[PDB]
Design an enzyme around this catalytic site. Structure first.
Site, PDB file in Angstrom:
ATOM      1  N   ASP A   1     -10.480   1.590   0.532  1.00  0.00           N
ATOM      2  CA  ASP A   1     -10.223   1.874  -0.874  1.00  0.00           C
ATOM      3  C   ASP A   1     -11.464   1.608  -1.717  1.00  0.00           C
ATOM      4  O   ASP A   1     -11.723   2.315  -2.697  1.00  0.00           O
ATOM      5  CB  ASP A   1      -9.045   1.039  -1.375  1.00  0.00           C
ATOM      6  CG  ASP A   1      -8.548   1.490  -2.735  1.00  0.00           C
ATOM      7  OD1 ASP A   1      -8.712   0.730  -3.713  1.00  0.00           O
ATOM      8  OD2 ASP A   1      -7.995   2.603  -2.827  1.00  0.00           O
TER       9      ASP A   1
ATOM     10  N   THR B   1      -2.724   6.639  -4.684  1.00  0.00           N
ATOM     11  CA  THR B   1      -1.728   7.052  -3.702  1.00  0.00           C
ATOM     12  C   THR B   1      -0.318   6.724  -4.183  1.00  0.00           C
ATOM     13  O   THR B   1       0.616   7.507  -3.980  1.00  0.00           O
ATOM     14  CB  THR B   1      -2.004   6.382  -2.355  1.00  0.00           C
ATOM     15  OG1 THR B   1      -3.402   6.465  -2.056  1.00  0.00           O
ATOM     16  CG2 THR B   1      -1.216   7.062  -1.245  1.00  0.00           C
ATOM     17  N   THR B   2      -0.151   5.569  -4.833  1.00  0.00           N
ATOM     18  CA  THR B   2       1.161   5.183  -5.338  1.00  0.00           C
ATOM     19  C   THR B   2       1.538   5.963  -6.591  1.00  0.00           C
ATOM     20  O   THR B   2       2.710   6.305  -6.780  1.00  0.00           O
ATOM     21  CB  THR B   2       1.189   3.687  -5.649  1.00  0.00           C
ATOM     22  OG1 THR B   2       0.368   3.429  -6.790  1.00  0.00           O
ATOM     23  CG2 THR B   2       0.659   2.882  -4.480  1.00  0.00           C
TER      24      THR B   2
ATOM     25  N   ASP C   1       0.835  -1.196   0.000  1.00  0.00           N
ATOM     26  CA  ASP C   1       0.000   0.000   0.000  1.00  0.00           C
ATOM     27  C   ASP C   1       0.872   1.250   0.000  1.00  0.00           C
ATOM     28  O   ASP C   1       1.905   1.299   0.675  1.00  0.00           O
ATOM     29  CB  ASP C   1      -0.928  -0.004   1.215  1.00  0.00           C
ATOM     30  CG  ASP C   1      -1.941   1.122   1.175  1.00  0.00           C
ATOM     31  OD1 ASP C   1      -3.005   0.950   0.539  1.00  0.00           O
ATOM     32  OD2 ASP C   1      -1.675   2.184   1.776  1.00  0.00           O
TER      33      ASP C   1
HETATM   34  N1  LIG Z   1      -6.546  -5.152 -12.535  1.00  0.00           N
HETATM   35  C1  LIG Z   1      -5.900  -4.101 -13.097  1.00  0.00           C
HETATM   36  N2  LIG Z   1      -5.610  -4.080 -14.415  1.00  0.00           N
HETATM   37  C2  LIG Z   1      -4.971  -3.039 -14.982  1.00  0.00           C
HETATM   38  N3  LIG Z   1      -4.572  -1.950 -14.300  1.00  0.00           N
HETATM   39  C3  LIG Z   1      -4.800  -1.839 -12.969  1.00  0.00           C
HETATM   40  C4  LIG Z   1      -5.493  -2.937 -12.278  1.00  0.00           C
HETATM   41  N4  LIG Z   1      -5.590  -2.581 -10.986  1.00  0.00           N
HETATM   42  C5  LIG Z   1      -5.010  -1.360 -10.857  1.00  0.00           C
HETATM   43  N5  LIG Z   1      -4.537  -0.919 -12.038  1.00  0.00           N
HETATM   44  C6  LIG Z   1      -3.848   0.377 -12.256  1.00  0.00           C
HETATM   45  O1  LIG Z   1      -2.935   0.623 -11.184  1.00  0.00           O
HETATM   46  C7  LIG Z   1      -3.077   1.954 -10.687  1.00  0.00           C
HETATM   47  C8  LIG Z   1      -3.009   1.930  -9.166  1.00  0.00           C
HETATM   48  O2  LIG Z   1      -1.696   1.514  -8.805  1.00  0.00           O
HETATM   49  P1  LIG Z   1      -1.390   0.729  -7.434  1.00  0.00           P
HETATM   50  O3  LIG Z   1      -2.204  -0.541  -7.391  1.00  0.00           O
HETATM   51  O4  LIG Z   1       0.109   0.640  -7.284  1.00  0.00           O
HETATM   52  O5  LIG Z   1      -1.930   1.719  -6.285  1.00  0.00           O
HETATM   53  P2  LIG Z   1      -2.854   1.145  -5.098  1.00  0.00           P
HETATM   54  O6  LIG Z   1      -2.059   0.099  -4.354  1.00  0.00           O
HETATM   55  O7  LIG Z   1      -4.202   0.787  -5.670  1.00  0.00           O
HETATM   56  O8  LIG Z   1      -3.032   2.426  -4.140  1.00  0.00           O
HETATM   57  P3  LIG Z   1      -3.268   2.218  -2.564  1.00  0.00           P
HETATM   58  O9  LIG Z   1      -1.893   1.888  -2.037  1.00  0.00           O
HETATM   59  O10 LIG Z   1      -3.812   3.542  -2.091  1.00  0.00           O
HETATM   60  O11 LIG Z   1      -4.253   1.076  -2.493  1.00  0.00           O
HETATM   61  C9  LIG Z   1      -4.399   2.490 -11.206  1.00  0.00           C
HETATM   62  O12 LIG Z   1      -4.202   3.773 -11.809  1.00  0.00           O
HETATM   63  C10 LIG Z   1      -4.871   1.499 -12.251  1.00  0.00           C
HETATM   64  O13 LIG Z   1      -4.910   2.126 -13.536  1.00  0.00           O
END
Ligand SMILES: Nc1ncnc2c1ncn2[C@@H]1O[C@H](COP(=O)(O)OP(=O)(O)OP(=O)(O)O)[C@@H](O)[C@H]1O
Ligand SMILES: Nc1ncnc2c1ncn2[C@@H]1O[C@H](COP(=O)(O)OP(=O)(O)OP(=O)(O)O)[C@@H](O)[C@H]1O
Ligand SMILES: Nc1ncnc2c1ncn2[C@@H]1O[C@H](COP(=O)(O)OP(=O)(O)OP(=O)(O)O)[C@@H](O)[C@H]1O
Lengths: 509, 509, 516
Positions: free
Chosen positions: B378, B80-81, B47
């Site tokens: 989330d 957030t990331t 996260d």
């Molecule tokens: N299943 C998926 N397929 C394609 N792209 C995805 C998928 N899930 C998330 N993403 C992409 O990843 C990005 C989010 O990145 P990330 O997962 O590193 O952050 P996060 O972990 O969701 O944030 P947080 O730590 O607040 O939960 C989004 O902008 C989205 O476009």
């Protein structure tokens, strides 16, 4: 060290004070980050904020700080204008020091060139009271508009320009910056920024007490307290440990009569509404709902500080000293629903000299950029009604004085010719730093501005919006003549205190 | 005491140390981070808000990135990331423009001008979801794909169903004003992931005083007291100390006469359920069995006040203040036993579309519980965003590549100096799908330059990047859907943090 | 990654060594550019801002940095102008691959992508050019004074310009032939007179003397070239001349007479009337007795010929060099109508040969002048005027100057990058940003802002055409077509092809090894 090299050691300590506030000139200037010993960061573009937090140890550098200390108490701002002007007076006479010129000749020409700067400004300052048959309300709406230009609220700049001219009208002849409050709450559109005639707070009191507490009052007695009325409070409790089981009923009842007798003194004073910094419990809001009394706790102390000045009361911590001598009075007491939150406010005070301007928006950077421009737009419309004889800002009065002090220098023989001629180039630090802090080309603007002043341009200056030159007197960018006189005499006096010093004496301690 | 370009490069090198640390943690294939806590505990997470809370950097530039994530956990939640990676490559592209001799104010205003083009491009390629009807079956499938990134992928369908009903309870769909504050989260060790329940009220982890009590309460009569219906015991500790036989035998006289009078008090008042702080006696629960009276024992301190706000009652401290006005209202009070685990929670449901929901998450391992609380929060902001705006955008990097094409096309229509800031804004916007390709184990440039060719040549709508190693592109068929407000604030707060950094040019400690 | 082996650090060493060559020569671009000062090892200081001299005076020893030296040498033979501008293009190109090599891109993918940017970059410069005619004498005359006005000699730019156009029309058929050889146009200069006293000889003019042959005038001249030294019998091996008496001393003098006259009698059988002898220092090419034997046979004496002057003769009259007297035939002779020595007041003692009547078209430009510094810059103004006519024959097109095609190349290749796929999209993006250095150099060398000038010029090219550019005369952005600053296409279109093959060769170099 006495003579020449002691002045060079004082002329290099002047550069480190001017360089701390060189980039902060203008509304679009760069910010500075000053971190104290505790680890807190302070981001500010204000020149008086930086100089209060530096605390320089050099003795020659402490002179330019104390001049800016006298400037903020009387005028209010412009500490970077008196710092860069006093610094550039020294950098032009610095090659004349090593030539063998005495520092008293620097003093005798600084007293002459300052008096020529006063006579040129008063002969060129134009009193703008009812020029071209316009209303005075439309004049402050145009001058506050340029303070909000090239900002994030340029889409609705006509609406925000009417908000500053309405807030200055509600006060008396005693105008001040600290009497106006600016609040920052998140949510809503940009055009939903309402205005409050009095003092309002966020009102985070989310305890019990609903279906009661009538929001309408004609002449209520405003109570100002700092007491806690909670059941699990840190100051109102009772813990008696015994074996007696009928005394176990007594320790729960007497703990309730501690809060009950403190609530009975509130209703005995006749206060209609009560205010408290400490939170109020549910059993105290229940008691006021039975006796038909309004209550609103969890208010900030800074919001209470603007309230006691307007309502005519004072803050009392204990509830024993609550009487009619400290209860405030107002005429209009209503309740709004601005932004979905509850808002308590008073209107129509006998000492109504304070207000609060609530901001709305979808982002916090859209609010903090405005409140930096809002405090500048307040002091612009404050200076407009105060001083009618104004001149054009944006370096227009500096380029005109550089023309008047140049040809008069060629008419004076002696050592005053090469010094006052250098005094005219020393006043060029105001239009030059307006170009570099805005990111423009300082070469092409200043060469075009000095060529316009020779042909007859007496009100042309540096435009901070575009990379053009424009008449700031016609573009409604103004500055008072008396502030420009007080900034010029303080800059030459501060430059005199560094030049006249010839030796430093340090006591062995 | 650092000024000039050497101080500005110290800010970019400090801010890129935060971005390149979190550049690998982008997407579902992101590399997780090990965190060594201060007490010796070692946890692992991916996260983005958890990394910045534990990253203790003493640099003032890195503390502003920590200050950036204080507000985006509540506003956008999902981005957030990516917002730290987008802010770091923006200063990296600003480092390229710094060698050309450009002032940061033209870059900060140039990034603000290029951000409004990307905001104007986001709503044009958007798509509507919830027009003219309410539905819950497509709203589940959008939240079912986002929650598959964590270790609750085996039970990701169950959390998608309860999170839709939880957001729709506290807010109205036609009012489009959703409050995430009214939805609280909890958890405890034990059970399984399928035992996560949703209540239309507030559930307390407290059991009855007698297992032979009825398992449902149909009456809307709840009494909330502090002392139980017995010889009253204090709230802190009993600390009994007998004197002699005459004191102990008179205690036996006092025990029986309050076992018949205090239970008589609940009948002349009219209440049914007795919620108290301390437990009931062993001889007291026999009389409650005959006359059909439930009771809850051993309720903690702050657990009492959260009951009275949902039930709408008042706290009754003594037996003399017991009245019918201080009762709370409820629809059905029951108890749920999670299989063989004797949990016996206090389930207070109103049987109506009310304004209070608490989701109680279970789990067989403690590491899954806190990771599911942030995953549900989330998912809390996602369904909150769809009610306020049914417009969504195609995720998986499809929104960033399509926005970068309109910015680079509109950069040629600007005859100012800020064209280099707009062209740098085009390449910096594509670093979020470019880190999606590097974290997925493919070529970062070959995957990026083939999707941008797909969005221009054969088809005009945007295509995504298959980071999960699916069949092909066009993640609309793969059901990867992100919100529009979560994307419009992703490019906004990343741009506004660059303007706060580019305006800082001196740190003094 | 681990990255134990490092073959890309030699590529970064090859890039940074070639980047220092272009960055040191960057400020010398343009007419208002800064000049360069050099110091020789003996202590000589010579001020010269021409880019072909500084690269000859730099004397680099690195193998990667030496590739920019012959890149400027190949531009002087192919186009004759545009010299330093190829180096700054190739220098800014290797700066753009420094960002590309850090990203993980292999250099052989950039090599096939830069050729695709070269094939597209030629197509942009074709339709934006202005086609002109070669038979029109007003076009070649007016475009040559505009290029010579920015040179050192501008007050004689109205005189040397029609002398260069009329020289190539007797050699090259206008608007039919494509090959133009500048070696067939020899420029002869001598002390005395002014530049206005000039003569266009259709034959050939030699700078030597016919001393001591007292003929000085021959008609029906059959010119022949002999590389053998017609002198006394000389043996490089060990030999001895035996002496017996005083009458034997007159016999070896008669032996030197009869041996040369036996060689002279071999010349008279083939009908040769003019003898050409190559310049020889190691031995005597002509003795005193051989000068008198050609006077009796009315044969003109011509010696002291450079090797480059031999190339001017064989294309003029068709004379082939012979190595020895036994290989002297009648087929290796030329043709001439009259050969004489004309000694004017300012032209000097020159041999004017008219009446070629031979397969071959060469001309000679005889330029006079008082000082030595007059005639050397008159030849540099002619060679700069001869190159802009040679550039117009191979490419019948004209373009504006002041970096105006370089801004159009940076904008059309950016639009071409949105339609490509794969690795080639980012290489043509770096190819577009590397072409913006040439207007940014001309913006800095003219005293303007280097960023604010090229940014305003990109928006002027999106709405208009290639007319917008940098005018160094007025010092600002103006219409280059209305300012009459027009350059040929072969200066720029060969600057792209030669710089692309050098960058493709530099990036393809992996390791540097030393042999013995
Ligand atoms: N299943 C998926 N397929 C394609 N792209 C995805 C998928 N899930 C998330 N993403 C992409 O990843 C990005 C989010 O990145 P990330 O997962 O590193 O952050 P996060 O972990 O969701 O944030 P947080 O730590 O607040 O939960 C989004 O902008 C989205 O476009
Ligand atoms: N809109 C503007 N356009 C051009 N120059 C401006 C503008 N606003 C302010 N300035 C420049 O900023 C300087 C004033 O700086 P600053 O705002 O820090 O002091 P101030 O607030 O005006 O002074 P005081 O403390 O007396 O109110 C002036 O010299 C003026 O030239
Ligand atoms: N009269 C002119 N007006 C404006 N720009 C010119 C003019 N002549 C040349 N230039 C520009 O100056 C550059 C060449 O500058 P410089 O004179 O240093 O080199 P050069 O020897 O003429 O050409 P090259 O560098 O190719 O050998 C060219 O790119 C051209 O665009």
């Amino acid at each position: 060290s006495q003579g020449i090299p002691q002045l060079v050691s004082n002329i290099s300590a002047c550069q480190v004070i001017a360089e701390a506030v060189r980039t902060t000139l203008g509304p679009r200037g760069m910010d500075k980050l000053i971190v104290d010993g505790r680890g807190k960061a302070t981001i500010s573009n204000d020149g008086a904020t930086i100089l209060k937090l530096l605390d320089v140890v050099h003795p020659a550098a402490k002179t330019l700080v104390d001049i800016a200390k006298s400037q903020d108490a009387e005028v209010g701002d412009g500490t970077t204008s008196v710092t860069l002007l006093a610094a550039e007076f020294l950098k032009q006479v610095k090659p004349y020091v090593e030539e063998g010129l005495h520092p008293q000749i620097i003093i005798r020409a600084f007293r002459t060139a300052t008096q020529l700067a006063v006579n040129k400004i008063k002969e060129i300052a134009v009193t703008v009271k009812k020029a071209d048959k316009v209303e005075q309300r439309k004049l402050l709406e145009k001058c506050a508009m340029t303070a909000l230009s090239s900002k994030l609220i340029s889409q609705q700049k006509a609406f925000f320009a009417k908000m500053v001219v309405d807030a200055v009208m509600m006060l008396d002849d005693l105008l001040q910056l600290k009497m106006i409050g600016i609040k920052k709450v998140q949510g809503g559109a940009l055009e939903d920024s309402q205005l409050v005639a009095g003092v309002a707070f966020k009102k985070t009191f989310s305890y019990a007490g609903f279906e009661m507490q009538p929001k309408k009052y004609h002449n209520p007695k405003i109570a100002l307290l700092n007491v806690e009325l909670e059941l699990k409070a840190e100051k109102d409790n009772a813990e008696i440990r015994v074996h007696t089981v009928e005394d176990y009923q007594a320790i729960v009842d007497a703990e309730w009569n501690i809060l009950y007798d403190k609530l009975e003194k509130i209703h005995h004073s006749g206060a209609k509404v009560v205010s408290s910094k400490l939170p109020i419990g549910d059993v105290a809001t229940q008691y006021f709902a039975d006796r038909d009394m309004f209550c609103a706790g969890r208010v900030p102390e800074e919001d209470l500080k603007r309230t006691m000045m307007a309502c005519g009361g004072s803050i009392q911590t204990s509830v024993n000293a609550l009487s009619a001598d400290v209860l405030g009075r107002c005429q209009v007491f209503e309740e709004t629903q601005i932004g979905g939150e509850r808002y308590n406010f008073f209107t129509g005070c006998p000492k109504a000299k304070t207000c609060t301007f609530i901001l709305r928006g979808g982002a916090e950077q859209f609010m903090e950029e405005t409140e930096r421009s809002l405090h500048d737009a307040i002091m612009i419309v404050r200076r407009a009604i105060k001083n009618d004889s104004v001149v054009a800002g944006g370096g227009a009065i500096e380029m005109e004085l550089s023309k008047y002090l140049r040809d008069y220098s060629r008419t004076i023989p002696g050592k005053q010719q090469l010094l006052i001629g250098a005094y005219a180039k020393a006043l060029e630090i105001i239009p030059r730093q307006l170009c570099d802090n805005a990111g423009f080309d300082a070469t092409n603007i200043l060469n075009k501005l000095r060529a316009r002043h020779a042909q007859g341009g007496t009100w042309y200056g540096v435009d901070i919006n575009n990379e053009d030159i424009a008449d700031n007197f016609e573009a409604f960018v103004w500055e008072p003549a008396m502030v420009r006189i007080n900034a010029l005499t303080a800059a030459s006096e501060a430059a005199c205190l560094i030049v006249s010093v010839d030796e430093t004496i340090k006591n062995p301690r | 005491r650092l000024m000039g370009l050497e101080a500005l490069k110290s800010h970019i090198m400090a801010a890129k140390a935060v971005a390149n640390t979190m550049r690998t943690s982008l997407g579902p294939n992101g590399l997780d981070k090990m965190m060594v806590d201060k007490d010796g505990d070692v946890t692992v997470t991916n996260d983005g808000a958890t990394i910045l809370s534990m990253m203790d950097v003493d640099h003032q530039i890195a503390k502003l990135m920590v200050e950036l994530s204080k507000s985006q956990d509540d506003e956008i939640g999902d981005g957030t990331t990516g917002v730290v990676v987008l802010a770091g490559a923006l200063l990296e592209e600003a480092e390229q423009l710094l060698d050309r001799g450009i002032h940061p104010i033209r870059i900060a205003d140039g990034y603000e001008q290029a951000a409004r083009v990307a905001i104007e491009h986001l709503d044009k390629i958007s798509d509507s979801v919830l027009v003219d009807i309410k539905d819950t079956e497509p709203l589940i499938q959008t939240a079912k794909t986002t929650l598959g990134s964590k270790v609750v992928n085996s039970c990701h369908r169950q959390m998608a169903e309860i999170a839709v009903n939880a957001v729709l309870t506290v807010a109205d769909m036609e009012r489009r004003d959703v409050d995430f504050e009214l939805i609280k989260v909890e958890g405890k060790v034990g059970g399984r992931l399928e035992d996560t329940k949703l209540i239309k009220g507030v559930i307390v982890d407290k059991d009855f005083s007698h297992p032979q009590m009825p398992k449902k309460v149909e009456d809307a009569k709840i009494a909330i007291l502090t002392c139980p219906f017995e010889p009253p015991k204090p709230k802190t500790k009993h600390k009994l100390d007998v004197t002699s036989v005459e004191d102990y035998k008179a205690l036996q006289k006092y025990e029986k006469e309050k076992f018949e009078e205090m239970i008589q008090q609940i009948k002349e008042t009219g209440a049914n359920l007795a919620i108290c702080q301390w437990g009931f006696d062993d001889e007291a629960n026999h009389l409650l069995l005959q006359n059909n009276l439930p009771a809850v024992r051993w309720v903690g301190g702050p657990e009492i006040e959260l009951i009275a706000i949902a039930t709408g009652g008042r706290i009754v401290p003594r037996f003399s203040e017991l009245t019918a006005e201080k009762l709370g209202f409820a629809g059905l009070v029951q108890e749920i036993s999670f299989g063989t685990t004797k949990d016996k929670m206090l389930v207070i449901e109103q049987c109506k579309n009310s304004r209070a929901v608490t989701i109680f998450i279970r789990g067989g391992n403690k590491m899954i519980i806190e990771e599911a609380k942030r995953s549900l929060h989330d998912a809390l902001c996602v369904i909150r965003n769809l009610i306020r705006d049914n417009r969504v955008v195609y995720g998986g990097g499809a929104a960033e590549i399509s926005c970068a094409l309109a910015v680079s096309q509109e950069a040629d229509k600007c005859p100012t100096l800020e064209q280099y800031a707009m062209r740098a804004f085009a390449d910096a916007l594509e670093v979020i799908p470019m880190a999606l390709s590097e974290n997925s184990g493919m070529n970062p440039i070959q995957t990026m330059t083939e999707v941008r060719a797909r969005q221009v040549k054969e088809m005009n709508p945007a295509l995504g990047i298959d980071c999960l190693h699916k069949g092909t592109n066009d993640m609309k068929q793969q059901h990867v859907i992100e919100t529009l407000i979560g994307k419009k604030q992703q490019i906004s707060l990343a741009t506004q943090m660059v303007r706060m950094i580019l305006k800082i040019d001196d740190i003094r400690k | 990654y681990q990255d134990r082996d490092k073959p890309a650090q030699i590529r970064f060493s090859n890039i940074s060594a070639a980047k220092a060559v272009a960055d040191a020569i960057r400020t010398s671009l343009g007419p208002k550019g800064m000049d360069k000062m050099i110091q020789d090892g003996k202590g000589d200081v010579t001020i010269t801002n021409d880019g072909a001299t500084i690269l000859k005076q730099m004397q680099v020893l690195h193998p990667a940095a030496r590739m920019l030296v012959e890149l400027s040498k190949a531009q002087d033979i192919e186009a004759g102008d545009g010299t330093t501008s190829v180096v700054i293009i190739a220098g800014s190109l290797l700066d753009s691959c420094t960002k590309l090599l850090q990203k993980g891109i292999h250099p052989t993918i950039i090599s096939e992508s830069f050729q695709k940017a070269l094939e597209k970059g030629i197509e942009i410069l074709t339709d934006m050019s202005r086609p002109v005619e070669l038979s029109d004498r007003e076009t070649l005359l007016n475009s040559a004074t505009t290029s010579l006005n920015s040179k050192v000699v501008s007050q004689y730019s109205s005189l040397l310009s029609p002398m260069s156009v009329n020289a190539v029309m007797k050699v090259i058929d206008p608007a039919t032939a494509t090959s133009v050889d500048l070696r067939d146009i020899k420029i002869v200069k001598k002390l005395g007179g002014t530049i206005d006293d000039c003569e266009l000889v259709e034959g050939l003019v030699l700078t030597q003397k016919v001393s001591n042959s007292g003929i000085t005038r021959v008609e029906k001249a059959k010119i022949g070239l002999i590389q053998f030294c017609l002198s006394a019998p000389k043996t490089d091996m060990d030999n001895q001349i035996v002496v017996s008496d005083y009458a034997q001393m007159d016999r070896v003098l008669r032996e030197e007479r009869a041996y040369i006259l036996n060689l002279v009698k071999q010349i008279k059988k083939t009908g040769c009337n003019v003898l050409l002898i190559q310049k020889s220092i190691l031995r005597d090419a002509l003795s005193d007795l051989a000068l008198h034997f050609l006077n009796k046979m009315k044969i003109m004496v011509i010696k002291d010929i450079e090797r480059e002057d031999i190339e001017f003769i064989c294309k003029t009259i068709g004379t082939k060099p012979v190595a020895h007297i036994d290989q002297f035939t009648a087929d290796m002779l030329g043709s001439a109508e009259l050969a004489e020595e004309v000694n004017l007041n300012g032209s000097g003692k020159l041999l004017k040969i008219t009446g070629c009547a031979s397969p071959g078209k060469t001309v000679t430009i005889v330029v006079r002048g008082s000082n030595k510094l007059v005639i050397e810059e008159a030849e540099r103004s002619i060679h700069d005027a001869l190159c802009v006519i040679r550039c117009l024959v191979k490419k019948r097109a004209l373009i504006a100057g002041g970096g105006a095609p370089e801004i159009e190349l940076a904008l059309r290749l950016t639009e071409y990058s949105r339609t490509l796929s794969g690795m080639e999209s980012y290489c043509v993006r770096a190819f577009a940003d590397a072409m913006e250095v040439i207007p940014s150099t001309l913006a800095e060398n003219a005293g303007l802002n280097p960023i604010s000038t090229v940014t305003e010029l990109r928006n002027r090219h999106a709405q208009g055409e290639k007319t917008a550019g940098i005018n160094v005369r007025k010092g600002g952005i103006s219409n280059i077509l209305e300012e009459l600053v027009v350059q040929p296409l072969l200066v720029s279109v060969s600057a792209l092809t030669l710089a692309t093959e050098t960058v493709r060769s530099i990036l393809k170099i992996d390791d540097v090894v030393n042999t013995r």
